Ligand binder design. Structure first.
Ligand SMILES: Nc1ccn([C@@H]2O[C@H](COP(=O)(O)OP(=O)(O)OP(=O)(O)O)[C@@H](O)[C@H]2O)c(=O)n1
Ligand SMILES: [Mg+2]
Lengths: 226, 215
């Protein structure tokens, strides 16, 4: 029942345009990454947190973490140039075979309820993601000019966490690294493997990712609402 | 220079800070000098409910209620028959109240220059096709855009588009699809704003309230 969580936090936050890691931005007085860490530190089934960071920020994370009452162990692991590389470095720090969750540092509003439903699906079938139905029309665009329209009734917008049996995720990462496949999520690595299957748990539209400046306004309102 | 806007219709009476979302949306087109007419397409049996709304919220810009078919595509078509001469027509979701005139002008500017346009933003999330709560494929993310409204077209061009799409069986999801599908159909894309959100659910209202107070 017990899991480890790998939290990629090693990005620069270029689209957020804060002039520093977006994850140090304060929401209601506490950095984004502190909100995210708190969800896992307060969740009884989380044994360990592996937080993947840019090595230049390590002393800053050391300080930052010492100011807060985290009781669960938090290991700082250096990341890489892309999220996938960062995730793989974090996963190599997990010590025993078990269920592992990978969760973006930039999603601070994940709830214990959804974490619970994912771990259950991963335990049964191996690989589970949070997701929500797409509501907008999606099209592909070449040089600000439409090339085609994707059918939407079956389309879903994927969230984190994504939950996996460690062995299965490590195998997906190792194959992807050897072949040069760079996926945008951990699920797509598993999908690329022969016989790879991923299941969907419906998530909350409040589990937003903080990516652009307008996402900070949505974030403040979600906080105030709860 | 000047456009009509067709708005196809109830969820639109959901409120945002005291007023139905449709009234916030109407205000934007009413405050825009290049908007000559607003055509609001409705179910014929709700004509009184709408008359009442428009009585309570007087607008200076001309607003015409028109009877609407059983689907958005048919409603938009019915709406377009109420446009009286050749010009740019917008088609806009009533539940998108935060459209800015700046974006509206770019949409027109492009659809006069080249015939058809849409507002859109880059997709931020990974998108998967899912069948029975099991992933079937991941859609390649890189050149993906989330489409908003309004969508702006030369009337002849779009009514032409509705004409041929009527002639085949083709039911569309939005209207830009009708342009892209027949002929050598070209739709340019104007990068919109992530604030141009659609309001249906109560989580949506939570965001909308925040956007309003922010600006
Ligand atoms: N090389 C990277 C890039 C991203 N991430 C992390 O992966 C999560 C999702 O990535 P994204 O939202 O793109 O964050 P950034 O890459 O930092 O932002 P941008 O793409 O706008 O630079 C973030 O918590 C980010 O810190 C990471 O650990 N290593
Ligand atoms: Mg990134």
């Amino acid at each position: 029942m017990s899991y480890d969580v790998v939290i990629p936090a090693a990005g620069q936050g270029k689209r957020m345009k804060a002039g520093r890691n977006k994850l140090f931005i304060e929401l209601k007085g506490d950095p984004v990454i502190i909100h995210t860490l708190r969800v896992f530190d307060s969740h009884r089934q989380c044994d360990k947190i592996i937080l993947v960071i840019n090595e230049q920020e390590r002393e800053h994370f050391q300080q930052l973490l010492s100011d807060y009452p985290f009781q669960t162990s938090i290991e700082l692991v250096a990341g890489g140039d892309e999220r996938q590389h960062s995730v793989y470095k974090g996963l190599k720090a997990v010590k025993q075979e078990k269920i592992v969750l990978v969760h973006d540092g930039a999603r601070p509003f994940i709830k214990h309820e959804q974490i619970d439903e994912l771990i259950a699906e991963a335990e049964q079938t191996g690989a589970a993601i949070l997701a929500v139905p797409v509501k907008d029309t999606i099209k592909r665009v070449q040089d600000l000019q439409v090339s085609e329209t994707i059918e939407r009734s079956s389309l879903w917008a994927v969230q984190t966490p994504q939950a996996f049996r460690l062995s299965l995720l490590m195998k997906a990462h190792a194959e992807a690294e050897r072949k040069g496949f760079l996926g945008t999520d951990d699920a797509s690595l598993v999908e690329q493997m022969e016989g790879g299957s991923v299941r969907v748990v419906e998530g909350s539209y409040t589990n937003i990712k903080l990516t652009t400046p307008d996402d900070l306004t949505s974030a403040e309102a979600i906080m105030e609402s709860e």
